[PDB]
Structure 1
């Protein structure tokens, strides 16, 4: 499927003939495009070594922090912009570094929803 082993091109531009099959420990997974929705939705992934990841697919609330160190749980209205991809803002995709608007103002996301399962943001003045 998604393989993250090595590049098939040398830095000089020459090609490389693959010399072995793909190992199971080198595979990736489908990206989780966290959307804005009415209700939150998450799943649990069993990972290498028998560990776990919490993957968030739909988000409804957020944790917003101020410079004083206090936090509040508020719900998300929409995504104003997203520098990661040119068309994420239209589709309401939340990633790290996106700018979202809430009921108490604009905020910037500081966590990785696909890896942590929660949305954390800092308030913009």
Structure 2
């Protein structure tokens, strides 16, 4: 019936730049200790399903999505320039697809 297009373009090369065209975050895995600079792919905290959204209004206590999964923003975007946070298990418990 309804031809619902959710075009999630696979944007991800080796483009070196400060967080604006490539949102970077230091994801500190709080159990394992894995500290890795991932990219914030979506800021799906409340803005669920890509509906013309590219909202990079990233605040402390927000659930963001990264290369390593969902993270709590522990800092403010602009402190160390880059964002930092701790890896969390909000999304993808039973299903690991969305």
Band of TM-score, shorter chain: 0.5 to 0.7
Could you list the runs of 5+ residues in structure 2 that have no partner in the other structure?
1-14, 47-52, 90-98
Could you list the runs of 5+ residues in structure 1 that have no partner in the other structure?
1-37, 42-57, 83-88
Superposition TM-score, scaled by structure 1 size: 0.44
Matched, 1:98 2:62: yes
Q: Aligned pairs, how many?
A: 66
The aligned runs of 1:16-55 (5 Å cut-off) are 39-40=17-18
* RMSD over equivalenced CA pairs, Å: 2.4
Task: List, as ranges, runs of 4+ consecutive aligned residues in structure 1 with deviation greater than 4 Å.
Answer: none
Higher relative contact order (CA 8 A, sep 6+): 2
Q: Tell me what 1:33 maps to.
A: none
Question: Which of these two proteins has the greater Rg computed from alpha carbons?
Answer: 1
Taking structure 1 as reference, are residues 112 and 90 closer, same or farther at Cα in structure 2, changes over 3 Å only?
Answer: same
Q: Tell me what 2:94 maps to.
A: none
Superposition TM-score, scaled by structure 2 size: 0.54
Q: Tell me what 2:25 maps to.
A: 62
Contact 1:78 1:101 in 2 (8 A): yes
